Amino acid sequence: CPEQDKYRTITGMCNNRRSPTLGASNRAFVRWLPAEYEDGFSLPYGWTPGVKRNGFPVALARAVSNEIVRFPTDQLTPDQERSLMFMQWGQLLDHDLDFTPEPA
Amino acid sequence: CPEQDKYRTITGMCNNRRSPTLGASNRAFVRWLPAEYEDGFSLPYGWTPGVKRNGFPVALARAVSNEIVRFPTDQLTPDQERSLMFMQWGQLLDHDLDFTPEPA
Amino acid sequence: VNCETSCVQQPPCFPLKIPPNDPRIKNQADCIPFFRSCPACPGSNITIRNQINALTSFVDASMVYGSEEPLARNLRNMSNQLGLLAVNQRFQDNGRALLPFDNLHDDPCLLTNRSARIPCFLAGDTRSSEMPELTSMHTLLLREHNRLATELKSLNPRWDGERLYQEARKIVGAMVQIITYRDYLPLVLGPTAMRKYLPTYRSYNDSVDPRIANVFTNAFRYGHTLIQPFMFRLDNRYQPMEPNPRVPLSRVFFASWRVVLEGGIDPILRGLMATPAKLNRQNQIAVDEIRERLFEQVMRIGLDLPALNMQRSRDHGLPGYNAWRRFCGLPQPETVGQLGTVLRNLKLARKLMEQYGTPNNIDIWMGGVSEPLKRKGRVGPLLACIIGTQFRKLRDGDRFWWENEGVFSMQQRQALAQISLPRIICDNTGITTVSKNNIFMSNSYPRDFVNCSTLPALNLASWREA
Amino acid sequence: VNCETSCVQQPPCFPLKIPPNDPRIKNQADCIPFFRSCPACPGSNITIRNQINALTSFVDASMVYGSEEPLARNLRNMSNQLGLLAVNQRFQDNGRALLPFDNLHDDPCLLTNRSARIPCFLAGDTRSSEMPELTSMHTLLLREHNRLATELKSLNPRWDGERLYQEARKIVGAMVQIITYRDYLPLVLGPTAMRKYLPTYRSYNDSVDPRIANVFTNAFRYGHTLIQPFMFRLDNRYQPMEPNPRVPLSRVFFASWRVVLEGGIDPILRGLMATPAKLNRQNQIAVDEIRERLFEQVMRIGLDLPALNMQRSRDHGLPGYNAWRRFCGLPQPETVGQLGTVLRNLKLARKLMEQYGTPNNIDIWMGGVSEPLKRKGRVGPLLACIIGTQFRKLRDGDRFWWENEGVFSMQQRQALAQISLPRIICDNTGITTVSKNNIFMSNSYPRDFVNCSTLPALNLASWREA
C-alpha cells in the first residue's frame, strides 16, 4: 500500500492500511456468528434425508413460501409513504455492496 | 450429532450442537481481530526486504530478543510467592488447549 | 450437471425440494433450480465453508465503476483524455447515452425477446439488466459521471483523462453515500434505530471492520417485500405511457430490449417516482410475480424469490432467528405464545411454528420480514439491528468516507451537501418535473412534485484547481 | 528448502535472520530455523491465511487422552475390560507406571543421550517429552486415570471397560478444570482481573464460541517468563538429589532418558513443589537457557524462544500491541512518554521504541510480557484480558463443564470440590510430604509442606450405580 494516495483503488485494496484486503473484492465475507451446517462444516440443512435441525425437520423453503409468504395479489397495499424509487435504490445500493458468486 | 450422548467425543465434535466443530480438533483458530500480513492475506511482516510495517522498518525478532529480553542470569529473581509447578501446570494446560501444526 | 436443467442434488447444486400438493409444481419429484454459492476455500475438510463477495464493500459506486481492474478499464472511454465512461455505440436514448452491451456466453436478455436481439448491458456490476428500473438507475449514474467529467474539464483544462475520471468518480461515490445515509437509511430503519445504530459521524476508525457480513447478504433482501408486480411507465405529464404503462414484472426481468426499444429511461424513472412501493404487511409479504414467476422468460420454470432467500441462508450456513435475536440483544421467543408477543401477531406466530417447529430454526429472512415494522421505518428490530450495524461499519471503516478529514475540502463538502437524486435526474434526462425531497417518501403526482428549474445545480467552483 | 538445515527463505521456511554483533551467532549468514505454521486453506488467493489447532480447545485433558480417534484408541489398554490407559511395558518407576514409548521417525529424545537409547513418550499430546517436568505431569495424570478406573471397578462391578474408561476420563477432565480455574487462573490474573473476566459461573451458554483465538496461542506463552534455567531434583527429605540436582535446561529438553534412568518422576515433582518459579521483571524477561540454548542437543543450532514467539506472531498475521490494547478497551500509547507511563518504565519504553518505532508495531508477546504485573497476578492488563477472555469462553461454552447441570450430580460435585494437585501426587507417587494448597503459591520446604495423611482423598461413593 502506497504511503499516500488520493483516490480509492478499484478493488477496495489498501483502504485499510493495517489489513489491506478488508472491504476489497473477491474475499470471504466476515461472519458475525459461527456457521451452522448439517455436518458442522459444509453441507446445508435440508441436504441429507432424515437429518433434522435442532430436533425438528427442516422446513422446505418452498413450503414456507407457500404457507407464509403467498398472498392474493389484489390485496397488495400501496405504501402511502414510500415511492417505488425507495425499492429501486435499495437494490442499486445492494449492488454496490455485495454479489455472491456461483458456478456457471 | 447424536440426539443424546453421555460423554465428550475425543475430537470435541458435537460439544456445540448448533455448530458441531466449535472447539473440535484440526480446525482453524478463531480470529478476534483481522489478520495483518505484509501483502494483506499471506506473507508475514519481515518477509520482504525494505517492506515496512505501518510506516516503520520491521525489527528482527532476534534483535528485539537480544536488546530487550536478554539479561545476566545472576540477576534472576526467584518468585517468593510462586512454585515452579505454577510454570509447569501452565505448559501442561497449554497442551490441553492448543497445538499449531507445521510441515515436517 | 447444470443446476438449471436437472434436479439431481450433487455439487454444485442444492435444488429446492417441492412440497406435496404445490399449487404450481405438480410433480413433487421435481424442483426449483439452485447453484450453491462459491466456497471461499474449495473442497476443504479443515475450514468451515464460507462464501465470497465479488464486490468492494464500501459505498463507492462500484456498481458503476467495477470492482476489478480489467473491467474498470473496459468500462472507460480510452479513445481520448476526457475521463469518460464508455457509452453504447449502437443506440441512444433521445440523444442521451445508454450503457454499452455486454458480451455474455448464454445472454439471458436475448431470451426475453428473441426478435428484438438486444443483449444485456455492461456495467460495474453484472446485474444491471435484471429489471429495467435498475438499468435506468445504472444509466442515470453513468450519465452523471460523464456530465461531471465534462464540467471538470472546462473548470480545469490541464487535467488529463485519469484525473478527470478519478475526480468525477470521487463525486459519484460521494453522491451515492449522501443519498444512502441522508435520504435512504433513515426511511428504512426509522428514527429510533437510526440514532442507535448510526450516531453522528466523528472520524474514520481504522479498527472498524468494513467487510460485508454474511448475514447481511440475506438480511438486506428485506427489500423483496417492497417489490410491486408491475413496471410502471409514465409520460412527460406523468400519465400512463401507452400502449403498455403497466408491464407485469415477470416480463421485464433481463428485458434490456425495453430500455432500448420502448422509450428509454425517462418513462421508467417517472414511474419509480410517482408510484408507491408495496408495503410489507404480515399477511402480504411478497408478490407472486417474484414468488411464482421469477425469471420466467429465462428459466425452464418460474423461480420463487422468497424460497430462494431461505435456501440461500442454509447454503450459507446462517444461524436461525433466535441466534440473531440474541446476537442483536433482542429477546428470544421460545414458544408460540412468546413468538406471538414479539410479532404482535399470534396467527403468524402459529403459522411459523407449524412450518419450523421452533423459533430457533426460522430462517433469518423469514423471521426478519415477519417482524412488525418500526415507527417510520420499513423493517422490524432484528433487521434494523443487522442492517444498521452493517452501514455504520461501512461508514466508520471507510478511509474515503466523504466526511473524512482530507477526502474533500470544507467548501467541497458544503457543495456536496446540496446534492439530491431529484437534481441528478434533472441533469441527466428529459424529465423536467421531479419529486420533492425526500424522493423515497414522495410518490404522488403532482402533489409531491416540483419543477427541475427550482432545484439549484451542484456548484463545482471549489473543484477549480488554483 | 529444508528449514532445519538451510537459511534460504522459501516456503514453508521463514528463518530468523541474525543481526550484526549478535552475542552468540557471529556469522550473519546463519539463521534460527523456523517452519511457518500450516495454513488452514493451502495456496488460496481468496482466504486471509489462518492457522490450525490440532487439539480440542476444551479443558478436557486431551493431552492425556488424545484429540483424534486413532491415537485415543492406541493410548488405551485394549487387553481387558478395566478401562485403563496403556503403560510402558519395558520400564517402571519404583514399581509405578510410565507412559508408553512413541514410535517416531526422527526421535529427538534419542539424540539427548546416544547411549541411553530412550525414545520419546507417547501421550495424548505430542509434546510430552519436551521437558522432564512436563513428562512427570503427564505420567502423574495417566496413573490417576488408572487408579480411578480401578476404584470405580470395585464400586460398579457391571461397568465394562468402556464405561470405566469414560468415567475415569470424565473425572480427570474435571480435575484439570478444577485445578485450573480454582487454583491456577486466579494466581495468573490476580483478584481484579479474575472477577472481571471470570465472574461466577452460571450455566452452559451454547452461544459462547469455545474455539481458541489465534492470539491466545502467542499470548499464553507469557509462561516462558516463568522458566527457571535448571531442572531441580530433590530426594525424599527434599534435599538436593545427588549427583545432579540442578541440570541446565538445555540438557533436559526431550531428555526422556532422565525420567527412565535418573530416578523417575518423584525427584522431579518434589523439585517443582519446593523450588520458586522465576519472576518476570521488565529487565529479567526470559532466561538464556531458552533464549540461547533452546533444543541445543537435538538440532544444529540452539534456538531463541522469545525470538521464535515474535516470529510466530508475524507468521500468524497477528496485529500489534496497540491493536490488542484497543481490542481490550485499554489506552493505546503513541509516544515513548505515553508508553513509558503504561509500562511504568521509561527505560523499557525507549528500548521498545528504538526497536519498533511505534507501539503499534510491538509484537503481542513482547508487549504483553513487558507490562507491569497486576497485583497478586503474574501478567499485566493486556495479557490478563486476552487470557481471561479465552478461559471464560472455554468455561461458559463447554457443554461438558463440570459444574453444568446434568454433568455431575450434586453429591458428585461436592466430592470433586475436595480434589487437589497435592492429593493427586500423594495418590500416585512415593512422595509422602506435599505442598499445602495453594500448590502454585507454596514453594518453601518445610514451611509450606504437610503430610499426605492430612489430605482427605476423593470419595467416589456417589459414583455407585447400585
Ligand SMILES: *[C@@H]1O[C@H](CO[C@@H]2O[C@@H](C)[C@@H](O)[C@@H](O)[C@@H]2O)[C@@H](O[C@@H]2O[C@H](CO)[C@@H](O[C@@H]3O[C@H](CO[C@H]4O[C@H](CO)[C@@H](O)[C@H](O)[C@@H]4O)[C@@H](O)[C@H](O[C@H]4O[C@H](CO)[C@@H](O)[C@H](O)[C@@H]4O)[C@@H]3O)[C@H](O)[C@H]2NC(C)=O)[C@H](O)[C@H]1NC(C)=O
Ligand atoms: C450467551 O453468551 C452470548 C455471548 O456473550 C459474550 O461472551 C460471553 C462469554 C460473555 O463474555 C458475554 O459478556 C459476551 O457478550 C451472549 O450474547 C451476546 O449478547 C450481547 C449482549 O446482548 C451481544 O451484544 C450486542 O451485539 C449487538 C450486535 O453488534 C455486536 O456485533 C458486532 C459485529 O461483530 C460488533 O461490531 C458490535 O460491537 C457488537 O459486539 C449490538 O447491537 C449490541 O449493542 C447495542 O445495544 C446495546 C444495548 O442497548 C448498546 O449498549 C450498544 O451501544 C448498542 O446500541 C450489543 O453489543 C452479543 O453480540 C451477543 N453475542 C452473541 C454470539 O449472541 C448471550 O447474551 C449469553 N446468554 C446468557 C443467558 O448469558
Ligand SMILES: *[C@@H]1O[C@H](CO[C@@H]2O[C@@H](C)[C@@H](O)[C@@H](O)[C@@H]2O)[C@@H](O[C@@H]2O[C@H](CO)[C@@H](O[C@@H]3O[C@H](CO[C@H]4O[C@H](CO)[C@@H](O)[C@H](O)[C@@H]4O)[C@@H](O)[C@H](O[C@H]4O[C@H](CO)[C@@H](O)[C@H](O)[C@@H]4O)[C@@H]3O)[C@H](O)[C@H]2NC(C)=O)[C@H](O)[C@H]1NC(C)=O
Ligand atoms: C474504533 O472502533 C473499534 C470497534 O468499535 C466497534 O465498532 C464500531 C463501529 C462501533 O459500533 C463500536 O461501538 C464497536 O465497539 C473500537 O474498539 C472496540 O472497543 C470496544 C470497547 O473498548 C472493545 O470492547 C471490549 O472488548 C474486550 C475484549 O472482548 C471483546 O471481544 C471478545 C471476542 O470477540 C468478545 O467475546 C467480547 O464480548 C468483547 O466483544 C472486552 O474485554 C471489553 O469488555 C470488558 O470491559 C468492559 C469495560 O470495563 C466491561 O463493560 C465488560 O463487561 C468487560 O469487562 C469490551 O467489550 C472492542 O473489543 C474493540 N474492538 C476492536 C476491533 O478493537 C474503538 O474503541 C473505536 N475507537 C474510536 C476512537 O472510536
Ligand code: HEM
Ligand atoms: C427488480 C428487483 C429485484 C430482483 C429481480 C431481485 C432478485 C434477486 C435474486 C434472483 C437474488 C438471488 C436469490 C438467490 O439467493 O438465489 C437476490 C439477491 C439479493 N437481493 Fe434482490 N432482487 C430485487 C430487488 C431487491 C431489493 C429492492 C433489495 C434490497 C433493498 C434486494 C436485495 C438483495 C440482496 C442484498 C441480495 C444478495 C446479493 C448478493 O449476491 O450478495 N433485492 N435478489
Ligand code: HEM
Ligand atoms: C519446559 C518449558 C517450555 C518449553 C521448552 C517451551 C517451548 C516452546 C516452543 C519451542 C514453542 C514454539 C515456538 C515457536 O513458535 O516456534 C512454544 C509454544 C507455546 N508455549 Fe511454550 N514452552 C515451555 C513452557 C511453556 C509454558 C510454561 C507456557 C505457558 C504457561 C507455554 C505456552 C506455550 C504456548 C501456548 C505455545 C503455543 C502452542 C501451540 O502450538 O499452539 N510454554 N513453547
Ligand SMILES: *[C@@H]1O[C@H](CO)[C@@H](O)[C@H](O)[C@H]1NC(C)=O
Ligand atoms: C468516447 O468519447 C467520444 C467523445 O465524446 C465519443 O464520440 C465516443 O463514441 C466515445 N467512445 C465510447 C466507446 O464511448
Ligand SMILES: *[C@@H]1O[C@H](CO)[C@@H](O)[C@H](O)[C@H]1NC(C)=O
Ligand atoms: C419484441 O421486440 C419487438 C421490437 O424488435 C417488438 O415489436 C415486439 O412487440 C416485442 N415482443 C413482445 C412480445 O412484446
Ligand SMILES: *[C@@H]1O[C@H](CO)[C@@H](O)[C@H](O)[C@H]1NC(C)=O
Ligand atoms: C493392561 O492391563 C494389564 C492389567 O493391569 C497389564 O498387565 C498390562 O500390562 C496392560 N497392558 C498395557 C499395554 O498397558
Ligand SMILES: *[C@@H]1O[C@H](CO)[C@@H](O)[C@H](O)[C@H]1NC(C)=O
Ligand atoms: C547417558 O545415559 C547413560 C545411561 O546409558 C548415563 O550413564 C550417562 O551418564 C548419560 N550421559 C550423560 C552426559 O548424562
Ligand SMILES: [C-]#N
Ligand atoms: C438483488 N437484486
Ligand SMILES: [C-]#N
Ligand atoms: C509450550 N510448549
Ligand SMILES: [C-]#N
Ligand atoms: C455496445 N456498445
Ligand SMILES: [C-]#N
Ligand atoms: C512402551 N512400552
Ligand SMILES: [Ca+2]
Ligand atoms: Ca462497493
Ligand SMILES: [Ca+2]
Ligand atoms: Ca483439550
